[PDB]
Structure formats: C-alpha cells, structure tokens
From a paper:
The crystal structures of the proteins encoded by the [name] and YP_001095227.1 genes from [name] and S. loihica, respectively, have been determined at 1.8 and 2.25 Å resolution, respectively. These proteins are members of a novel family of bacterial proteins that adopt the α/β [name]-like fold found in STAS and CRAL-TRIO domains.
Author numbering:
A (entry chain A): 2 to 126
B (entry chain B): 3 to 79, 82 to 126
Amino acid sequence: DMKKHGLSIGINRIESVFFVTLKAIGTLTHEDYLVITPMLEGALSQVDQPKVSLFLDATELDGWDLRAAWDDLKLGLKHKSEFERVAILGNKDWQEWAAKIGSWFIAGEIKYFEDEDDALKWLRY
Amino acid sequence: MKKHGLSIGINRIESVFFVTLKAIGTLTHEDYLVITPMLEGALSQVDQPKVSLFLDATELDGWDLRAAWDDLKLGLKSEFERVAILGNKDWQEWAAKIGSWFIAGEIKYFEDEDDALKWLRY
C-alpha cells in the first residue's frame, strides 16, 4: 500500500570528498524503467569531477522482472570518465540482483558490502 | 563521516509516480556548484504531466546564506501539483526557504512521513 518503488541519484560530500550516491528500492517494473532511467541518465551526465566514485544503497531493493530492461542498464559519466570505485551495499543474504547490478557501471573496482560505514570508509580512503 | 548533499529521484507508491528529493547536512557554495547541475539534469527529464514532489529535509541542517542556494529555483520542463516538505525543525529556520525553490499549486510542511505521502497522492 505505502511501499515505495524506484531510485534516487545524488551527490554527497564526506570528509571534503564528493561522491555520487544511488539508492534503489522495491520491485522495479518495465514501466518503472521507462519513467525513472531517463532521469538517472540526465543527472549522471552532469557530474564532472576529476575523480569520482559511487555509493549504491540497494539494502531496500527487491529486484526486477526476468530479463527486464534493468539487466542492461548502463549508467556512465559526463565525459566518458569511469568511476574509480563503486561500493554496492546489500544485506546479509544474497539477493537476485547481486551478480547483475554491478554491470550498470564501468568502475576501476567494485566492492560489495553489508554495512554502510565500511562501504563509505572504503570509498573515502 | 557526516554526509552533506542532495539526492533526486522518482518513487512509485501503488500506481502513482512522484518526484523525491532528500537534502542532508549543511550545504556550501562548492556543494551548489557540484550538485545543482545534476539536480537540473534530472528534473529536465521528468515528463509526467501531473506530478508532485516529496522533499525529505529531516536530516537537513541548513546552507551558507551567501551561497547560491538561497536563490535556487527548481522546475519542470510544467509545474508540480503539490510539494510536501518533511522536517523536524521550526518551519521558519529552513522549510519556508527550501519551499520557495519550487512553484506548485500547494506547498505544505509535515513532521510525519505517512501524512506527507498521503497528502501528495490525494
């Protein structure tokens, strides 16, 4: 009834360093892809930092439909830059998107976490 | 490891899409220069003809008054029906100020999330 579904993209500064943030939540549909991804793309294309990394909060993501457009989503940076690091935060138990959601990104390194503090420390230092 | 910044999104509750924006920490002029182009890039892609905005300012401490944040105007390509601002502080500190970034039929301040969201989808 009140369950939320979708994603948000942002920029956060932590200890003087800016990073891109992404939060995915609920169960994503085809309609959701059509409505939400142009906005994510529009946002990410305006990020122009010397080096930049990404924090992906997927703790509240259920997943998406079999072979949905979400499998092939690509989120890239303003001048074809790659993310230095991408920290993917999940939960204790494996979820259907675990081995798939990383492919949205071109990254120097992708690391998976169950604790936000650890994820942020790895990104920052 | 205190976070300072803003995120923008689209969420759906049942069958209704709404724009969502969360602001956190104390925003500086450098933050403005880095975040506002992305915020504007996101908003220019919202095509839904009837749409509202949920603004989560629960973790917002404020911004530098000499920074461009005071003057920010966010909009659609073309207006929000409703903007629901969620926060804990006396409204006169920042709620009216951040509310003024938007043009909308109605702009309302809430301390309860459930009530804010219900009001947006009515």
